[PDB]
Design a protein around this ligand. Structure first.
Ligand SMILES: CCOP(=O)(COc1ccc(C[C@H](NC(=O)O[C@H]2CO[C@H]3OCC[C@H]32)[C@H](O)CN(C[C@@H](C)CC)S(=O)(=O)c2ccc3ncsc3c2)cc1)OCC
Lengths: 99, 99
């Protein structure tokens, strides 16, 4: 589909058998999701933006479904105020910016 | 143009007569630029990001040219990690997400 930017570009995603709302975010290098108890091994990481850094758990090779499109890659989990889908997954669903 | 997301969507902008690099960011509601001198009145404002809140200078009705496309709108100036073009100006240049 084509998503205009009058409102936050929020979409439903499916991760770990759960449905969540996430922002399609071209400014996010990586995908960051609100705290959730994913199984598997993980590595600590810190990611920074406006206001400083937060501590997150980095999980690799996680499958996510974004509006029916399937994607698999690194997901960071942590105390983020919003779920963000980042470039690492947006590239996989064929997402582009057009103006 | 159609911009893919394998690399950061960095573009040249023209603001206050000076060229700069900025990231097109569909997860940003607002446009936030690193510290710089901007002609005009401004009011103090706060904006919240992943890491908390920061103090910025809010400049209203600023002319900015983004890959040749003209926008006129609010620009926030403060300690952001990178210059970001937010939805308030992306909508002006007719930007959409497509996948
Ligand atoms: C209801 C809202 O609650 P809130 O007010 C704010 O919540 C939020 C709303 C949206 C976003 C997404 C973020 N946008 C943003 O910061 O936009 C601000 C400017 O425009 C305003 O609108 C939105 C907020 C205001 C950017 O898109 C992405 N970022 C990087 C960017 C800043 C360039 C370095 S990233 O998220 O830091 C991030 C993600 C993955 C990653 N991998 C490695 S680094 C790394 C960094 C974050 C928080 O809570 C305050 C405590």
């Amino acid at each position: 589909p084509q998503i205009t930017l009058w409102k936050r570009p929020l979409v439903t995603i499916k991760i770990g058998g759960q449905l969540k709302e996430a922002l399609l975010d071209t400014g996010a290098d990586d995908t960051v999701l609100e705290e959730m108890n994913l199984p598997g091994r993980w590595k600590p990481k810190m990611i920074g933006g406006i206001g400083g850094f937060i501590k997150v758990r980095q999980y690799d090779q996680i499958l996510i479904e974004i509006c029916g499109h399937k994607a698999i890659g690194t997901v960071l989990v942590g105390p983020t105020p919003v779920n963000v889908i980042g470039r690492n997954l947006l590239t996989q669903i064929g997402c582009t910016l057009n103006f």
